[PDB]
Every structure is written in structure tokens, then in C-alpha cells.
Design a protein around this ligand. Structure first.
Ligand SMILES: *CCC(=O)N1CCC(Oc2cc3c(Nc4ccc(Cl)c(Cl)c4F)ncnc3cc2OC)CC1
Length: 293
């Protein structure tokens, strides 16, 4: 009872796109921005390009990104098979939501924060429909297309469940993981809900570091001792109670992604009741409008 993944993997000519700038660099490789002009099409699509034996890793990320299609999940546009392997995706001009929430903290309203909480829950709920566990949900891994539209990205750690994933050992983001993921290395859709709670806490604190000034090894014990992240200042008890529910030790008593949509959507209908913030070329086609079946 496992469905065939009939997603299409589009191979892109190196001619079809040009690089423009370097958006970011890390070990493996650098992420760049550029334009993609499919030959004989008269369209220019703003894209972001990301170019060992780690090719097995980047090709696993491409498989996952090519198999998702949701307004709040970044989809792979294609890959380029030159001397280096490149991943081409739609350009998210405003960067990651973590940096955006930091560089604009004096201009972000409750309506935007709660809407972001709704959109991330919508994208996370879609990944659960597709039986996909992200395992690395964080504010740094949510990209901003427009201030009103954010999407989930970075599926390097994502794993597809059959019809409870048991990792072995890898550089993992300790401070965002559920307690069972720390101790047993078990990952469930409800393990992503814990990460979702930390991600919401990142937004409501305008980019603060969770457990700032704490060793990563001491985290497993303080979570057993009953300790969680503090109530952010702008957070009513209503919003903070939801974040606390995502961090319960019993994983099945945690909120579901389908329910986090409903609760935050109800809150976005009256944002100031739940968040208290002081003073509330020519042929360019966005990739969300370029659809080839
Ligand atoms: C906040 C953390 C941080 O330092 N960075 C994250 C955002 C980067 O800037 C931009 C990145 C992208 C990406 N990234 C991307 C991720 C996975 C894959 Cl496979 C591919 Cl191909 C990617 F391109 N995607 C789309 N748009 C942007 C836009 C960015 O800034 C404008 C820099 C480092």
C-alpha cells in the first residue's frame, strides 16, 4: 500500500540559467541566485542554485524536493549535471525567516507572526499527508518569498516513512529535537511538532537562540527535569500554551499539524488579542506561475 512516486526529475542545461550573485556559503557548497531562461520559452525565472561522495546526500535532497508540491513547501525546479551537481529552485528573495525576523523586528506585527505560524503549519501538514518527516524544522529553514508568503525548505535530513524513523549518527540540531529524538533517535511527525514549537518560539522572540548559553549535552537532562523555553514577552498565555503543548513528553498528546492550523488561524482572525507588540526585466515570471506538466 505504498504509492508510486511519479514525480518528474527535470534535467536542466547549464545554458538555460545564469548565475548572478552568491547568496550564501558553507562547507559542502555555496547557494547562488540567478535567472533561468528555458530555451524557446520567452520567460525569465528568478532561481536559486545550490552546487566528494556527498553527491549521494545532495541527490537525496533533490529526490525529496522534486516529490513535494504545496504553496508552503519549496519545490525543486530541476538539477544540472555538469562537473558539479547543482540544485535549482525558485528564488525566495527575502531570505530565511530567521534573518528576516531579526532585521525587521521593529516592523513585524502580530498579524504577520500568526500568519507565518499558520503557513508553516499548513506546509508541515502537507508533508505529513505525503508521509514525510522533515527532522530539521527551524526558523533558519523557512524561506520568505514575500513578507506575506513563507515556505519550508532544506530537506537534507528529510526521510520518507513507510505505510518512526531510526537514525544512526549525524550532526543533528540538538536544541530543536524532541526528547525521544535525543535519547532514542526516533523521529515521527509528532517529533516535527516539537520542532515546530521551537520554531514558533524563534518567531515570537524575534530571533532569539533557544537555550542560549547552554551546552548541547546538558539539554537531554533539563528536558527530563521538566524544563522548557520561557514565555516570550509578546506572547499571551494563549499562544504560549500552544507552544508548551508541542513540548509534552508524551508525543501523542501533542497537537497535530491539522489542529495547529485551526488554532493559529483563529488567532490570526484577531491578532492583537493574542500578541502584544508595542505599536501594532519584462518577461520575468515567478516560478509559482511557471507550470509545465
Ligand atoms: C538564515 C540562514 C542563512 O544564513 N542562510 C539561508 C538563506 C540563504 O539565502 C537564500 C537562500 C535561498 C534558497 N536556498 C536553497 C535551499 C536548498 C536548495 Cl536545494 C536550494 Cl537549490 C536552495 F536554493 N532557495 C531559494 N531562495 C533562497 C533565497 C535566499 O536569499 C535571498 C543564505 C544562507
Amino acid at each position: 500500500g505504498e504509492a508510486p512516486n511519479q514525480a518528474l526529475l527535470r534535467i536542466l542545461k547549464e545554458t538555460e540559467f545564469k548565475k548572478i550573485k552568491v547568496l550564501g556559503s558553507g562547507a559542502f557548497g555555496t547557494v547562488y541566485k540567478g535567472l533561468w531562461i528555458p530555451e524557446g520559452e520567452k520567460v525569465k525565472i528568478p532561481v536559486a542554485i545550490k552546487e566528494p561522495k556527498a553527491n549521494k546526500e545532495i541527490l537525496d535532497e533533490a529526490y525529496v524536493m522534486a516529490s513535494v508540491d504545496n504553496p508552503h513547501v519549496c519545490r525543486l525546479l530541476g538539477i544540472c549535471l555538469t562537473s558539479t551537481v547543482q540544485l535549482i529552485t525558485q528564488l525566495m528573495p527575502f531570505g530565511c525567516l530567521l534573518d528576516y525576523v531579526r532585521e525587521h523586528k521593529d516592523n513585524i506585527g502580530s498579524q504577520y507572526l500568526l500568519n507565518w505560524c499558520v503557513q508553516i503549519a499548513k506546509g508541515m501538514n502537507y508533508l505529513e499527508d505525503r508521509r514525510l518527516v522533515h527532522r530539521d524544522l527551524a526558523a533558519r529553514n523557512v524561506l520568505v518569498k514575500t513578507p506575506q508568503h513563507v515556505k519550508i525548505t532544506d530537506f537534507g535530513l528529510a526521510k520518507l516513512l513507510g505505510a518512526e524513523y531510526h537514525a544512526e549518527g549525524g550532526k543533528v540540531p540538538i536544541k530543536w529535537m524532541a526528547l525521544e529524538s535525543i535519547l532514542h533517535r526516533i523521529y515521527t511527525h509528532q517529533s516535527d511538532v516539537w520542532s515546530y514549537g521551537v520554531t514558533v518560539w524563534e518567531l515570537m522572540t524575534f530571533g532569539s537562540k533557544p537555550y542560549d548559553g547552554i551546552p548541547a549535552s546538558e539539554i537531554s537532562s533539563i528536558l527530563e527535569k521538566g524544563e522548557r523555553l520561557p514565555q516570550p514577552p509578546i506572547c499571551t498565555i494563549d499562544v504560549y500554551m500552544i507552544m508548551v503543548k508541542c513540548w509534552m513528553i508524551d508525543a501523542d498528546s501533542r497537537p497535530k499539524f491539522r489542529e495547529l492550523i485551526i488554532e493559529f488561524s483563529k488567532m490570526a482572525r484577531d491578532p492583537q488579542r493574542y500578541l502584544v507588540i508595542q505599536g501594532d526585466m519584462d518577461d520575468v515570471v515567478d516560478a509559482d506561475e511557471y507550470l509545465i506538466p
